[PDB]
């Protein structure tokens, strides 16, 4: 993946205005409800969902903040995405046994939660650069799956 | 398949946002074509394949009209969308793989437009619904 | 959905190859795990996750037993596979995205084993069928 | 995508023993029947399918031979796949208007037709290297889609 300057500006702009403490938790909370099989990796935290069926565990949800900071790295050096995520890839695959498809599902959740917050500032071209970035990180995260 | 919970969820959401279906469709089609430009091949017979072009705006109303019809036929989407399926399958020959791309764009638009309405719970049922929509639209293809 | 043409096509093929279902499943599971090693996470509780390992061979018979059951329930796969769906959804929590990966591997094995039987026409109906299988297996997931 | 020596040997070995005049036509003929919307790009050749429903037009089928020779190029220099296919990508997108998803569908057909011919020599590891190669060509073919 190469990057135009406009894409670099868009992604930098998205992350500077992003409240990770809000976006992050909402996105993982949403993914655990829309793609419920993902709760398999947090099941041991216990006390995951509401009587009402919402994934109310702030602790588990707070992993979404770490995801977003995990995204910082690709964002900091977009010319090095693939090498940027080897230890993280190694970890989700070898220690966490996380299905890589789940990276796609969470990305989708991130995009939609971001969409809700930015509203009409989340233009087609913004969604475009942001999806393209997420894609590249996702791919890099599935590299150490052997 | 959609549960009675899913159907109520989708009818209640639509009940709330259907008023904006023209803008939701304009916006959803624009996003698809910009974020997934390979889909523009199916629209290359239009003179303006640009976001919010008059062709895009007009077609956006039809798409969401089809989505209004799918809510109305939510209990039997195969039968409900049979004519739309035949259209896309034999007249237009659209690769059915593209349906989930527009569906994703519809979810993005609704979130931008109705953030407080488009809850995790609304999202899971609409996702299941849009997935049933794609499946019914694929009916007549092979 | 499957036409009467599709169903006959799938029952006639199975009628011909079911005799080899144990080898087809051994081979299909081995391929998935080697060509799509990320799927080994769901099998990492086995001591030998290698092609034709005794665990792989054994499980291969169950998978194709499930496929024999899907042929038998081909007129209503949702109901037919409901128990298998619940298994994969709540007990094992397998991402439903993986079903089409094994399905692809089943098609590859059948082609290698039954090249003259696995015609374009047999292939299109089996493809539609395996797709209906995945959809029914996804039933209990959300 | 990087390549191990074993993968390079496998792919070279597959193409040296491949009868393009057989594999090629069978694979496109099969894809036009299993993924019938692909006939949209050949519809103008006319006389496509059998009364019996088979895609019997040798001419159209013969495009499958050109596909396989199109694969020669990536195979000849596997370290340059992405740059190898720019003019072909440009052509299928800008002149032919071909949906890129169709590249995936044909690849799948190719793999299965190859599978039928090689039989038990089409091992799991062979399928693996061959799929990985097809994937890389597919990706390179969708690059000039703008
Ligand atoms: C694709 C985007 C993702 C990114 C960038 C990401 C990043 C991270 C990071 C930075 C950590 C913490 C590592 C440390 O402690 O140094 C982590 C841990 C973890 N991740 Fe992810 N992750 C992603 C997706 C997922 C998905 C989709 C799942 C499962 C559905 C998942 C499951 C986990 C689990 C279970 C942990 C362990 C944390 C704990 O036990 O406290 N991750 N991930
Ligand atoms: C949510 C899924 C979709 C719905 C509900 C939908 C709905 C519709 C409707 C109602 C029409 C008009 C039918 C007529 O002319 O009588 C239409 C036409 C069309 N659709 Fe779709 N559509 C969907 C997805 C797609 C996708 C994914 C594509 C391709 C990327 C596509 C390509 C077209 C084209 C090219 C036309 C004809 C335009 C023209 O007449 O100039 N559709 N669609
Ligand atoms: C064609 C689609 C499939 C069919 C027909 C099928 C069939 C079966 C059957 C019959 C069982 C045994 C149920 C029981 O224990 O009572 C089973 C178990 C299992 N399946 Fe599937 N399966 C399919 C796809 C998959 C996929 C794609 C995966 C993951 C990549 C998967 C993962 C598992 C696992 C991990 C088990 C349990 C193994 C154990 O008990 O140690 N299945 N499957
Ligand atoms: C993904 C693998 C593919 C490769 C490597 C490939 C390669 C080629 C090549 C080498 C040519 C001839 C260009 C020339 O004349 O110099 C060609 C033409 C063409 N391709 Fe493909 N192709 C692929 C897939 C497809 C697919 C999936 C379709 C549509 C379903 C398609 C539709 C066409 C058409 C319509 C032509 C024009 C040939 C004629 O009119 O005689 N191709 N392709």
Residues in B touching A55 (Cβ below 8 Å): 120
Report CA A82 to chain centroid distance, whole Å.
16
- Please report where in the chains the tokens 């493809």 appear, as a residue: C127
Separation of C41 CA from ligand 3 center, angstroms? 13
**Contacts for D73 with CB less than 8 Å, ≥ 6 apart:** D84, D85
**Contacts for B58 with CB less than 8 Å, ≥ 6 apart:** none
| Half-sphere exposure at residue D55, Cβ-oriented, CA atoms within 13 angstroms | 28
- Determine if residue D35 is left, alpha or beta; phi over 0 gives left, psi from -120 to 50 gives alpha, anything else beta: beta
φ/ψ of D49, rounded to 5, equals -115, 150
Instruction: Of C109, C100, C99, C6, give the one whose Cα is nearest residue C51.
Output: C109
**Contacts for D101 with CB less than 8 Å, ≥ 6 apart:** B38, B95, B97, B98
Query: Cα(C42)–Cα(B104) distance, rounded to whole angstroms?
Result: 28
Q: How far is CA B130 from CA B39, B107, C104, D120, in A?
A: 18, 9, 24, 41
Q: How far is CA A5 from CA A9, A41, A136, B132, in A?
A: 6, 37, 17, 39
Q: Does C75 touch chain D (CB under 8 A)?
A: no
> In this structure, are residues B21 and B64 in contact, taking their beta carbons and an 8 Å threshold?
yes
Query: Cα(C92)–Cα(C42) distance, rounded to whole angstroms?
Result: 8
Q: How far is CA C56 from CA A131, C31, C62, in A?
A: 38, 10, 10
Known binding residues of A are 63, 92
Instruction: Of A25, A15, A17, give the one whose Cα is nearest residue A129.
Output: A15
Separation of C82 CA from ligand 2 center, angstroms? 34
Closest chain C residue to the Cα of B123, Cα to Cα: C142
> In this structure, are residues D35 and B142 in contact, taking their beta carbons and an 8 Å threshold?
yes
**Contacts for D53 with CB less than 8 Å, ≥ 6 apart:** C121, D33
Q: How far is CA B9 from CA B25, B107, C111, D137, in A?
A: 20, 14, 44, 43
> In this structure, are residues C12 and C135 in contact, taking their beta carbons and an 8 Å threshold?
no
Report CA A60 to chain centroid distance, whole Å.
14
Of D115, D124, D131, which has the smallest distance from its Cβ to C111's Cβ?
Answer: D115
Query: Cα(B122)–Cα(B137) distance, rounded to whole angstroms?
Result: 22
Helices (H), C18-119: 21-35, 54-72, 77-86, 99-113
Report CA A87 to chain centroid distance, whole Å.
16
Query: Cα(D9)–Cα(C138) distance, rounded to whole angstroms?
Result: 39
> In this structure, are residues A104 and A136 in contact, taking their beta carbons and an 8 Å threshold?
no
Query: Cα(D16)–Cα(C124) distance, rounded to whole angstroms?
Result: 29
Report CA D29 to chain centroid distance, whole Å.
12
Q: Where are the domains of chain B?
A: 1-142
Q: Where are the domains of chain D?
A: 1-146
Helix (H, G, I), strand (E, B) or coil at B92: coil
Query: Cα(A88)–Cα(A6) distance, rounded to whole angstroms?
Result: 28
Which tokens in the block code for residue A26? 């909402």
> In this structure, are residues A4 and A60 in contact, taking their beta carbons and an 8 Å threshold?
no
Helix (H, G, I), strand (E, B) or coil at D55: strand
**Residue B114 gets which letter from DSSP?**
-
Q: Whose CA is nearest to atom 35 of ligand 3?
A: C42
CATH match for D1-146 among 1.10.10.10, 3.90.1300.10, 2.40.128.20, 1.10.490.10 = 1.10.490.10
**Rounded (5°) CA angle D101-D107-D113:** 145
- Please report where in the chains the tokens 């399928």 appear, as a residue: D127
What single string gives the DSSP state of each residue in chain A?
Answer: ----HHHHHHHHHHHHS--HHHHHHHHHHHHHHHSGGGGGGTGGG---B-TTS-B--HHHHTHHHHHHHHHHHHHHTGGGHHHHTHHHHHIIIIIS---THHHHHHHHHHHHHHHHHHGGGS-HHHHHHHHHHHHHHHHHHTTT--
Rounded to the nearest 10°, the torsion over CA C80, C84, C90, C95 is -100
Which tokens in the block code for residue B142? 């092979």
Instruction: Of B52, B50, B71, B49, give the one whose Cα is nearest residue B61.
Output: B52
Helix (H, G, I), strand (E, B) or coil at D4: coil
How far apart, in Å, do the first and last CA atoms of chain C sit?
21
> In this structure, are residues B28 and B109 in contact, taking their beta carbons and an 8 Å threshold?
yes
Separation of D123 CA from ligand 4 center, angstroms? 28
Instruction: Of B82, B87, B70, give the one whose Cα is nearest residue B139.
Output: B82
Instruction: Of D99, D93, D40, give the one whose Cα is nearest residue B93.
Output: D40
Q: What CATH number does the domain located at C1-142 have?
A: 1.10.490.10
The neighbour count for residue B22, using CB atoms within 10 Å, is 15
Q: Does B1 touch chain C (CB under 8 A)?
A: yes
Q: How far is CA A41 from CA A45, A95, A97, A135, in A?
A: 9, 11, 8, 22
Query: Cα(A24)–Cα(A135) distance, rounded to whole angstroms?
Result: 17
Instruction: Of C91, C69, C73, C76, give the one whose Cα is nearest residue C140.
Output: C91
Closest chain D residue to the Cα of B41, Cα to Cα: D97
Helix (H) or strand (E) holding D99: none
Query: Cα(B31)–Cα(A101) distance, rounded to whole angstroms?
Result: 23
Query: Cα(C36)–Cα(A48) distance, rounded to whole angstroms?
Result: 31
Which tokens in the block code for residue B19? 């008023």
> D131 and C35: CB-CB below 8 Å?
yes
How far apart, in Å, do the first and last CA atoms of chain A sit?
23
Query: Cα(C39)–Cα(B64) distance, rounded to whole angstroms?
Result: 38
What single string gives the DSSP state of each residue in A92-120?
Answer: IIIIS---THHHHHHHHHHHHHHHHHHGG
> In this structure, are residues D28 and D108 in contact, taking their beta carbons and an 8 Å threshold?
no
Report CA D67 to chain centroid distance, whole Å.
5
Query: Cα(D44)–Cα(D47) distance, rounded to whole angstroms?
Result: 9
> In this structure, are residues B68 and B24 in contact, taking their beta carbons and an 8 Å threshold?
no
Can you give the length of chain C in residues? Answer: 142
> In this structure, are residues B70 and B77 in contact, taking their beta carbons and an 8 Å threshold?
yes
Q: Across-strand partners of A49?
A: A55
| Chain A interface mutation, best of C33, C40, C97, highest count of A Cβ atoms under 10 Å | C97
Which tokens in the block code for residue A20? 């990770």
Helix (H, G, I), strand (E, B) or coil at D110: helix
Q: Does C141 touch chain A (CB under 8 A)?
A: yes
Alpha-carbon radius of gyration of chain C: 14
How big, in percent rounded to 5, are the helix, strand and coil portions of chain B?
75, 0, 25
The neighbour count for residue C7, using CB atoms within 10 Å, is 16
Query: Cα(C100)–Cα(C117) distance, rounded to whole angstroms?
Result: 22
């Amino acid at each position: 993946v190469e990057w135009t300057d406009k894409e670099r500006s868009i992604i930098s702009d998205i992350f500077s205005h992003m409240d990770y403490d809000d976006i992050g938790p909402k996105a993982l909370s949403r993914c655990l409800v829309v793609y419920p099989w993902t709760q398999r990796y947090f099941s041991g935290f216990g006390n995951l969902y509401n009587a009402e069926g919402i994934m109310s565990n702030a602790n588990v949800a707070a992993h979404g903040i770490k995801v977003l900071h995990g995204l910082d790295r690709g964002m900091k050096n977009m010319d090095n995405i693939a090498d940027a995520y080897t230890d993280l890839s190694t970890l989700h695959s070898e220690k966490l046994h996380v299905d890589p498809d789940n990276f796609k599902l969470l990305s989708d959740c991130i995009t939609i939660v971001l969409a809700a917050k930015m509203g009409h500032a989340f233009t087609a071209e913004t969604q475009g650069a942001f999806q393209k970035f997420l894609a590249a990180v996702v791919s890099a995260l599935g590299k150490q799956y052997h | 398949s959609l549960s009675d919970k899913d159907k109520a969820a989708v009818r209640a959401l639509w009940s709330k946002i259907g008023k904006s279906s023209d803008a939701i469709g304009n916006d959803a089609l624009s996003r698809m074509i910009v974020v997934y430009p390979q889909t523009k091949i199916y629209f290359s017979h239009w003179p303006d394949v640009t976001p919010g072009s008059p062709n895009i705006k007009a077609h956006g109303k039809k798409v969401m009209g089809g989505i209004a019809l799918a809510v109305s036929k939510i209990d039997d989407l195969k039968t409900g969308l049979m004519e739309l399926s035949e259209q896309h399958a034999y007249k237009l020959r659209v690769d059915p793989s593209n349906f989930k791309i527009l569906n994703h764009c519809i979810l993005v638009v609704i979130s931008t437009m109705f953030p407080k309405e488009f809850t995790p719970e609304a999202h899971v049922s609409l996702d299941k619904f849009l997935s049933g929509v794609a499946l019914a639209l694929a009916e007549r293809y092979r």
